[PDB]
Amino acid sequence: ECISVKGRIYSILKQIGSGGSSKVFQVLNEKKQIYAIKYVNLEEADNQTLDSYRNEIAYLNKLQQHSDKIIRLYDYEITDQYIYMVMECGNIDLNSWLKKKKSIDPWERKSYWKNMLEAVHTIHQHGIVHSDLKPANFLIVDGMLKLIDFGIANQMDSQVGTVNYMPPEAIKDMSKISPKSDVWSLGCILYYMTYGKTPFQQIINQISKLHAIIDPNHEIEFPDIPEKDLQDVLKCCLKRDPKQRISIPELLAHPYVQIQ
Secondary structure: OEEEOOOOEEEEEEEEEEOOOOEEEEEEOOOOOEEEEEEEEOOOOOHHHHHHHHHHHHHHHHHHHHOOOEOOEEEEEEOOOEEEEEEOOOOEEHHHHHHHOOOOOHHHHHHHHHHHHHHHHHHHHOOOOOOOOOHHHEEEOOOOEEEOOOOOOOOOOOOOOOOOOOOHHHHHOOOOOOHHHHHHHHHHHHHHHHHOOOOOOOOOOHHHHHHHHHOOOOOOOOOOOOOHHHHHHHHHHOOOOOOOOOOHHHHHOOHHHHOO
């Protein structure tokens, strides 16, 4: 049918998904402008769960002003039973688009990489460490990557939670989860954009994958390519020791990102 936020009326074009029962929709306001509206049901949420949603909502609203690589939260209404959020409506999340794409335009990969670092740098400036980045977390809005989520709301339809992007600090640390950890994941994303698979995607035993990820003897292949900067980038993010790992400010001054 049709939804009203705060005021304020919206026709429902489609449903982008069921969280669930978070439920995203393609919607249209009175001016027939397209937004994305995220309904969430608080009916059965507790202290910390609720307080995590508030917190993510809180940052998303504040971090608006610091970068345009964060998804626009235009307006939102929240009660004791639910949340509605009016948001920037994208074209397609990165993960899906990559599965479709057979291989990417080299210059487009560089473009997204800049978009990615930019958004993640922002949240890092405010002392947020996402710690769980996948292509899924990025939305192509008008040919441009935007981070749609800060991984604060860590609580809620197959089993599809991959450890392909997990940094080795996480796994040894059983502290050391820092922004460097976020670099590790971003490396994997580019690596996939670069080479086709993620570093340990070929291994299929989750338990091994882990042992592999944290084992220095296990060496990631970096097949030689035209873009030897891209290779250099890839080599620096996937350095198993955080200290040895490169930082995002340093990545922003990298020839790969800066030189054409």
